Write a protein that binds this ligand. Structure first.
Ligand SMILES: *[C@@H]1O[C@H](CO)[C@@H](O[C@@H]2O[C@H](CO)[C@@H](O)[C@H](O)[C@H]2NC(C)=O)[C@H](O)[C@H]1NC(C)=O
Lengths: 172, 51, 109, 172, 172
């Protein structure tokens, strides 16, 4: 995509997460499974609803054309009425189609940004205690069990605590 | 006894801003009329409280 | 022990709030109001030249010389014309005035 | 944000920099304080002024409606005049509100891009001579005093010169 | 730029690649030269053509004003006709100029995203077998000859195969 997460490294998506839009799954000898991010998904959902309510209501007022009849000595006036109403229909039609197109593209790239950002957010957290596989997955230089996996999720995985085991554990 | 460069039936206007919600029918060198309540241009960035 | 260098942005006491498509009311450092919501509630001269007030008289009543329109018998140059919605003094003797609106539009110039 | 710098890792901003929009502060045993980037801030300011002068002047020409009166046998013509002038007011109102909304959002994300980009610009410079803390701050594997801090600022911090001290200095 | 690739680290561009929009050149003792990416360039080209065909055809219908004459007792009707046709010209003119401006900016930043993304795509592939110079070039911790350079291009450079030679080869 535009931020390179989707059809970038992540390369596809998981039918196995119904919990929300994006998230994780892990391999712990302890256990493995799909759990999706509360905060990011929430945010994106809110933003989107705001976008659709913002568009559909940005035509609340908008041109509506009703009726008219003219004599055959009124021909100019008739043509003028026609050209105007037609003109406005054209205008609002353009406005609508275009706004939809833009907001669409902007929406998709928006999702991209969300993903890539979530990723970078994880990376800047766990960074040197793990290898980035380049596929959008983090291989461990130690064991983070699950409580602490969920500590990764909640945003504090407590770096220095797990620093040393991986510090010696890595190399080789 | 007032003087103005722009006049509307509801009152006059002294403005540097290129728009008004006041009245559709004006006389003078005037800013452009719209039906908006608020028009606000972001210049700077978002405010994040220092934490 | 060490040396380090951070990176960051501005911030202030500003409550100034904007909107967007994605996000509703949002507080930012700085913004410009491009809309003028205020008027002095007065009717004024326009570049030193005052309007012609038709008072209680219509344009017809004026040009025709309705007696109730008197001070209007002689008038200086004007920047514009102030007339009421439904002025009292027009045609005292009942009647009609042909192409009245076309005439008033002519007067706009 | 969209580029993840603001309300991303940087997490907030410094009331202590009045010098411009974004920049740095450092801890040198030599000294510490807030100094903000000349070039980036300059650029952003210019771009923004160009955006506002671009919008406010994109309505210079724009529809202005003056007057009209019709007889009671002119009712259709009157209604047509009304529908047209109203129609245009609606149109320009929409155009304005919408343009403002877009340019706003685009402005904020713009600032984001500026920040994140400045950061990445620093990182790609100092990279292996320092630890990224993940908070948007760079911890040193050597001492960069201040002249050389300002060499970081000016864009050439002279990598290989300081390479070795940190090369051995790191690990542990 | 917005994604920081152009007039960011890459700092300029190569008159020596006519093969397409963006790509690489390498130094192999084996050989050196400019070769540009098939897939990315193809994609961008397609997207752009879609953008221009999308705009130029988003006015296919659009207001066209033909003729009229009025008597001198028709003055109001004349002024109304004038105000309307003028009004629409103004409207479509605005629509056009604006759409062009947006699609332009969005196009340039689009190219940026393409570049930066291609780069990150390479990096996430070769990462620890090479040093990022920060200038937008990758220095080798081993020899990738050319077949395998073209394996970098085709997207599989076979990491673990070349892992060890660089694993010991690096440090120092
Ligand atoms: C239109 O607005 C301007 C600006 O407020 C007014 O001019 C100012 O008048 C005040 C009071 O005399 C002075 O202190 C300022 O120096 C003036 N500024 C400028 C730019 O001229 C002006 O009075 C207003 N017009 C009217 C007639 O109300």
């Amino acid at each position: 995509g535009l931020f390179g997460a989707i059809a970038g490294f992540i390369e596809g998506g998981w039918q196995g997460m119904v919990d929300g839009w994006y998230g994780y799954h892990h391999s712990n000898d302890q256990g493995s499974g799909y759990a999706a991010d509360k905060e990011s998904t929430q945010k994106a959902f809110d933003g989107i609803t705001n976008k659709v309510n913002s568009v559909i209501e940005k035509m609340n007022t908008q041109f509506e054309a009703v009726g008219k009849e003219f004599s055959n000595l009124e021909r100019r006036l008739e043509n003028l009425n026609k050209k105007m109403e037609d003109g406005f229909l054209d205008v609002w039609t353009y406005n609508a189609e275009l706004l939809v197109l833009m907001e669409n593209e902007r929406t998709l790239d928006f999702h991209d940004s969300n993903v890539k950002n979530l990723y970078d957010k994880v990376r800047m957290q766990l960074r040197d205690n793990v290898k980035e596989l380049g596929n959008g997955c983090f291989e461990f230089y130690h064991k983070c069990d699950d409580e602490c996996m969920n500590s990764v999720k909640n945003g504090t995985y407590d770096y220095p605590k797990y620093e040393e085991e991986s510090k010696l554990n890595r190399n080789e | 006894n007032c003087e103005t460069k722009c006049q509307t039936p509801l009152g006059a206007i002294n403005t540097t801003l290129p728009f008004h919600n006041v009245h559709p029918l004006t006389i003078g060198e005037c800013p452009k009329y719209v039906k908006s309540e608020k028009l606000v241009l972001a210049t700077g960035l978002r405010n994040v409280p220092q934490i | 022990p060490g040396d380090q260098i951070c990176i960051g942005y501005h911030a202030n006491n500003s409550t100034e709030k904007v909107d967007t498509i994605l996000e509703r009311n949002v507080t930012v450092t700085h913004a410009k109001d491009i809309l003028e919501k205020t008027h002095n509630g007065k009717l004024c001269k326009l570049n030193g030249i005052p309007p012609l007030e038709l008072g209680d008289c219509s344009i017809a009543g004026w040009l025709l010389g309705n007696p109730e329109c008197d001070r209007l018998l002689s008038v200086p140059e004007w920047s514009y014309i102030m007339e009421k919605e439904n002025p009292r003094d027009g045609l005292c003797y009942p009647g009609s005035f042909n192409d009245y609106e076309e005439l008033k539009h002519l007067l706009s110039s």
